């Protein structure tokens, strides 16, 4: 619902979505999602799991 | 101006978006399942 959305919002009207009660197993994005930029600021990536 | 003790060259081919994953403390498909750099990594990463 986030990375595979058909339509994205404009930057001046950027969309905000609440995420709650879920498991952030981002490895499922490894199959089809390729990201040019992935920068974490308040947490190290390797600890995200 | 330096001499290097144990020079090892690790060569492979990845995606353009996965070049950023070649770092000591990165996560991702390549960093987790394919090629991981040590936290105390001493060396140089080159990609073209
Ligand atoms: C649906 C959103 C859930 C967010 C939960 C909050 C924190 C979890 C963290 C990171 C998830 C996104 C990882 C994207 C990059 C994957 C690795 C890569 O390709 O380099």
What Å resolution does this PDB entry report?
A: 2.4
Q: By a Cβ cutoff of 8 Å, what residues of chain B touch chain A?
A: 15-18, 20, 25-29, 31-33
C-alpha dihedral, B37 to A49 to A30 to A24, nearest 10°: -160
User: How was this entry determined?
Assistant: cryo-EM
Using the beta-carbon criterion (under 8 Å), do B15 and A34 form an inter-chain contact? yes
Q: By a Cβ cutoff of 8 Å, what residues of chain A touch chain B?
A: 27, 30, 34-38, 44-46, 48-49
C-alpha distance across the termini of chain B, in Å: 25
Contact between B48 and B16 under an 8 Å Cβ cutoff? The reply is: no
- Contacts (Cβ under 8 Å, ≥6 apart) of B37: B22, B23, B24, B26, B31, B45
Reported as type and span, the H/E element at residue B29 is helix B29-29
Using the beta-carbon criterion (under 8 Å), do A45 and B15 form an inter-chain contact? no
């Amino acid at each position: 619902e986030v990375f595979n959305a058909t339509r994205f919002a404009s930057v001046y009207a950027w969309n905000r979505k609440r995420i709650s009660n879920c498991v952030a197993d981002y490895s499922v994005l490894y199959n089809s999602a390729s990201f040019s930029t992935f920068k974490c600021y308040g947490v190290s990536p390797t600890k995200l799991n | 101006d330096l001499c290097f003790t144990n020079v090892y060259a690790d060569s492979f081919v990845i995606r353009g978006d996965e070049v950023r994953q070649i770092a000591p403390g990165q996560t991702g498909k390549i960093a987790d399942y394919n090629y991981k750099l040590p936290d105390d990594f001493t060396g140089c990463v080159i990609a073209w």
